[PDB]
Assembly symmetry: D2
Homo-oligomer: 330 residues x 4
C-alpha cells in the first residue's frame, strides 16, 4: 500500500482528545458557534450533533472541506452522543426559536422537553465537560440543564447576557465614537425583556457617565440613553424581522465564552448562574451577573453594587424568571 510505502508508523495508541468541544444543534446559531470556534483555534476536535441526518452530515462535510485553512484536525458528527465523548465543553444550541412578537419565555415547554433527552445523553460521555447553554429562554434552560444534569452549578453556564452587554457596548461606542473594547457597561438579568442596564457602572476610562449626567438612563435624560437599552432588548427581534433569525453575533459571543473556558482566562462575563443569596433573592434563580469564567466554569461571582432602583429592577427580573421556574414540569 502507498501509505506504508511513504510512511513508517512508529506508534500505535491514540489517546483522548485534549481540548474537544461539542456543539449540539446545527441550525444557524449552532453553525455560527462552530465557525467562530474553529476560527479562534480553541479546539483540537469539534463534534456536531443534531437529529436531521442529511443536514448534519452536510454541515460537517462543509467544515471539513475548509480544514486546510484551519488548525482543528478532527471534525466529526453523529446523531449518537457517543461522538461527543471526552468533550471539555459542550454547547447546547438546540430547540425552538422565538418568532416575531413571541417572548423567549414562550419557548420553555418545547425546549424543556428537548433538554430531557439531550442533557443526559450529553453528560454521559464527557466527565470533564462544562455545559454551556445557548438555547432560549437561556436562563430558565440553564437552570433546567443544571437540574437534569445533576452537575455542580460551576459547570452549568448560560450564554446569558454576554451578547446583550456586547450590543450595549457596541451602541455606546457608536454614540461616543469609541471602540466597544473601550466602552464599559453591564446589562444583567434575563436575556430577554426584563434585562437591567447597570447605569451606575457605565464608563469610559474609569469615568462614570452617570457622574457626568445623573439623569443617564432615566426618562429625564435629555440624550435618552435608556433607548440604548431598549435597542438591546429589541435587537434579536429587529434582526429576526429583517433576516429571519440571528446567528453571527451570538456565535461570536459564545465563542468569547468558549475562549475564557478553554484557555482558563478568568475573565469576567455577564452569564447565567445561580444567584440565590445575592440582592433579595432567596430562591434558586438563574440569571446573568458578572462571573469569573475559567477551565472549571464559573468559580467566582462578582458582587455588583447596585443603586436601589437597579436592584429593584434586578429583583423584578429575578421574580419573572422564578415565576417560569415554578411552571417547570420535570
Amino acid at each position: 500500500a502507498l501509505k506504508d510505502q511513504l510512511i513508517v508508523n512508529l506508534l500505535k495508541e491514540e489517546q483522548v482528545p485534549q481540548n474537544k468541544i461539542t456543539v449540539v444543534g446545527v441550525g444557524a446559531v449552532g453553525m455560527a458557534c462552530a465557525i467562530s470556534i474553529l476560527m479562534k483555534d480553541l479546539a483540537d476536535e469539534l463534534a456536531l450533533v443534531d437529529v436531521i441526518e442529511d443536514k448534519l452530515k452536510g454541515e460537517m462535510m462543509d467544515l471539513q472541506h475548509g480544514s486546510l485553512f484551519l488548525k482543528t484536525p478532527k471534525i466529526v458528527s453523529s446523531k449518537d452522543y457517543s461522538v461527543t465523548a471526552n468533550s471539555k465543553l459542550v454547547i447546547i444550541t438546540a430547540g425552538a426559536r422565538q418568532q416575531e412578537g413571541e417572548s423567549r419565555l414562550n419557548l420553555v415547554q418545547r425546549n424543556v422537553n428537548i433538554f430531557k433527552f439531550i442533557i443526559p445523553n450529553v453528560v454521559k460521555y464527557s466527565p470533564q465537560c462544562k455545559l454551556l447553554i445557548v438555547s432560549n429562554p437561556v436562563d430558565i434552560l440553564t437552570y433546567v440543564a443544571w437540574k437534569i444534569s445533576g452537575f455542580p452549578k460551576n459547570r452549568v453556564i448560560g450564554s446569558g447576557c454576554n451578547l446583550d452587554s456586547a450590543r450595549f457596548r457596541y451602541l455606546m461606542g457608536e454614540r461616543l465614537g469609541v471602540h466597544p473594547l473601550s466602552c464599559h457597561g453591564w446589562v444583567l438579568g434575563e436575556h430577554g425583556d426584563s434585562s437591567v442596564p447597570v447605569w451606575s457602572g457605565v464608563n469610559v476610562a474609569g469615568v462614570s457617565l452617570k457622574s457626568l449626567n445623573p439623569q443617564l438612563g432615566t426618562d429625564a435624560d435629555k440624550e435618552q440613553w435608556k433607548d440604548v437599552h431598549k435597542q438591546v432588548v429589541d435587537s434579536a427581534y429587529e434582526v429576526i424581522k429583517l433576516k429571519g433569525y440571528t446567528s453571527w453575533a451570538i456565535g461570536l459571543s459564545v465563542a468569547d465564552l468558549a475562549e475564557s473556558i478553554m484557555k482558563n482566562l478568568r475573565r469576567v462575563h455577564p452569564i447565567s448562574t445561580m444567584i440565590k443569596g445575592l440582592y433579595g433573592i432567596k430562591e434558586d434563580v438563574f440569571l446573568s451577573v458578572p462571573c469569573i469564567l475559567g477551565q472549571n466554569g464559573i468559580s467566582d461571582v462578582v458582587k455588583v453594587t447596585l443603586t436601589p432602583d437597579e436592584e429593584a429592577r434586578l429583583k423584578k427580573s429575578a421574580d419573572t424568571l422564578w415565576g417560569i421556574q415554578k411552571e417547570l414540569q420535570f
Copy 2:
C-alpha cells in the same frame, strides 16, 4: 452633550479606509466570506451590497452586534454602490447559485446578465480595486468581469480551484493520516466537472506519490486514487444535496485568497486567470493554474510541467469552457 463633557475632540478627520473590503451578495456564500474575513482581521472596513433591503440590513446589524469580538471597526451596508467606495478588494458572490443535480455551468447566462449591472457599479466607486469573482461558473464569470470592467487582467481574479485543491489536500490527508498542510497537490482547470488533478506533482515532504505508485490517479491504479479527484468534483453536489448549498469551505477559501491579496504575501494559489498562450490555447479562456497572488493581484504564473495526459485533460477543460463561453450574449 454627554460625549463632549467626556471627550475633548482634537481632529475632525473623516478619514478614508485604508484596507477596505466589499462583499457583493449576502447569500450563504457571501456571508461566509464576510465572517471569515472579519475573523482573520484583514479589513478596517467591511461593506456589504445586495438588492434585498431587509436581508442586507439584518446581516449587517447581526455582524455589527459582534463588534466587541472583532477588530474591524466599521461594518456598513447599502443597495447603493457608493457604500463600496475606496475598496482595495471587491468580492463578488452574487447571482443564481448551483442547484441540486445541476452543473455550475447552468447558471451562466443569468449571472452574465447580473454582472452587466454589478461590475460597472463596482468599477465606478473603486476603480483601482482588485476584483475577486466567486459567483458560478467562476471561470467564465472572471472572464466576463474582466471584459466588462476594463481592468488589466492582473486585477481580475477568480476563486477558481483554490477550494478544489483544499478539498483534495483534505481528502489526501485523511487517507495518509497527515494534516492537509503537509499533503501537497494541485487540482487545476475548471472549478467544476472538468478539473484536472496534477498527479505528477502530488507529494508529501517532497516525495512524489507517483514515484511510489506510477499508476497513481489512472484506471490502472490498484488504490483508485482517481476516486479522490472524483470526490473533489462531486463535493459541491453532495453538500448541496445534504444541506442545500455550500458556504463554509468557500468562505474560508475566499478569505485565504483575500489574505494573500491584502497582505501582499505572494503565495501561490490555483485560481482563475487568462490562460491564452499556454498549453496551445489561442482564446481568452480563464481557468485555474498556479498563480502568485499579491497586492497587485496576479503578477506571475508558475509553469506547471504536465504529462501528456494531464495536458490533454487541461486542454479539454479549456475547450469545455470556451464552448460555453463563445455562445454567450454579451
Copy 3:
C-alpha cells in the same frame, strides 16, 4: 534562468508597501517591538534602522530567517533612512538607556541630540507616517519629536503610560484572581517616578474598588494597595536590577499601540500627548492621559474626572516634566 523557466512574469514589479512599519533602534526594546509586531501581523513590510552596521545586519537576518513562520513578506534594514520610505508607522526606540539608580529624565540631553538627527530623517522619507516615541524620557521626547518633525500633534504619540497601566492591571488581577483584561485602572502622568494612579477609576465589572474600601491607595489602607503603584513605579528599575534591561513588556505595549493605529481601532490608551488646557496646565507639557488612538493617531482625549488628591498629583507630574523641558535647547 531557472526563475524564468519556473515562472512567467505577467506584471512589471513596482515596490510600494501599503502597511509598512519602521523600527528605529535594534537594542532590546526595538527588537521586542519588532518581534511582537511581526507576530501580530500588522505590517506588510518591516524596516530596521540603527547606526551599528553588524548588529543591524545580524538582527535583520535573524528575523528574516523566521519568514516561513510569519506573514510579513519583506524585512529590510539599513543605516540609510531611505530604507524607511513610505512607512505608515515609525517607532523610535533609539537612544541612551537608564542605568540602575538613574532617572529616565537624566537621558534627556543625550536623546534630544540624537532626535535632532533621527526625526528629520524619518519625516523625510515617510510624510504620511505616525511617529511612535518609545525612547525615554518618553513624554519630553514626544514633545521634542513634535517640535522637530513639523507634524501635527495627533501624529506624534508617546508609548507613555500604556505599560505602567498594563503593570498596574497585571498586579491588580494577581491580587484579585481575575484576568488583567477584566481589571480596570489607569496610571497617568509621566512614564516614570511621578506617575499618578487614578484610584477613583479602579474597578472590576464597573464596581469601584475605592467605594468598597475608601482608604484604597492611602497609607491607611490595611491591604496597602499603594504598594501596587509603588511596584509600577519601581518595575523598570527592579527588572533592570535583575536582567540588565527591560524588553518584553514594553515591546508588547508598543505592539498594542501599533495595532490600534494600523487597524484604526479607536481604543483608549494612556499615552503621551499635549495636555495644555486640561487640569489648569498652560504650557506645552506632554504626558499620558487616556487618548483615542486610530489611523490618524490621537484624535480625542478623555477628560478623566479626578479627586483633588489625584488632580494635584497630576499637576505635580506636569510641573516635574516642565521643570526639565523648560530648559531644553535644540
Copy 4:
C-alpha cells in the same frame, strides 16, 4: 477583605493547567521560544527554569508585565523543577552555546553534564511530558535526553533541521520572488555542517526545480544553488558573528513545533529522531528526517527517497554523529 467584598468564591479549584509549557533556560534562545509561544497562545501556563536566580526572576517579571496583551494567564519561574509540574511539553534550551567560529559539536560534554541534572528533574515532575530538545548539538542531546529520561522515543524530539529548512525556503523564496510558504524543500540529517539538502524534493507548486535544471545543487549549476545550502549551513555562524548569537528564527521554529505538538496537527517537520532501520543505519543515531508531529510527539516517519549521493551524504551525517554519541559518559 477587599477581594472578598468584591467577589464571592464558589469552589476551591485545583489550578492544574491543561496546556502547560515549560522552557528550561532563559538565555537568548529560551526567551525567544517563550515570547513566540506566548504570542501564539499555545499554553495556559508558562514555567521558566534556570540557575541564575536574578536573571530568571527578571525575565519572568518582564513577561508577566505584558499579561494584559496575552492569553497565558499564569507565568511562573523557579530554580526548582517543582515549578514545571504537569507540563505537556518541556523545551530544553539550556547549556553552553556556540562562540563565534565554534562547531556545535564542541558543546557536547558540557551540555551532556548539564543534561544529567536537568532531564531527571524534568521527568520527575512531568513524567508524561513530551521533551523538545533545542540545546546543541541538538541531535546528540536528543539521544542523551532519551537515554536519561527513559521515555519512549516518540516523546523525545529535537528541533533538528526545522530551522535549517525554514532558512532554505526563505532563501529560495527570496531567489524566486515567492513567499517561502509556497517554496518547498527539505534539509535533513545533522543540524549543522553535515546537513543534507534534498534537491530531488525542492519544488514550487509541485514543479521540481531539479527537473527544470538537471544540474541544480551541483558544482556544475550555472546559478550555483548549492550556495543556498552553503548559506543554510553558514547562517548561525554568520548571525553569531554579526550580533553575538541567534534567537528569533530559532524561537519561531521551536514555537511552530510546539504548535504542532500542542494542537495535535500531525504536520510534517524535519526534526531529530531515532532513525535506526533507515538508510542502512544499524545504530541508535538521532538526526532529522521528515516526521509527523502530534500530541504524542513523533508518531510516524516519512520515508524520503534520496539519490545515491544524497543517501551517502546522510550516512556521512549519521557516522559523524554516532562517532561522538557512542562514547558519551552518563
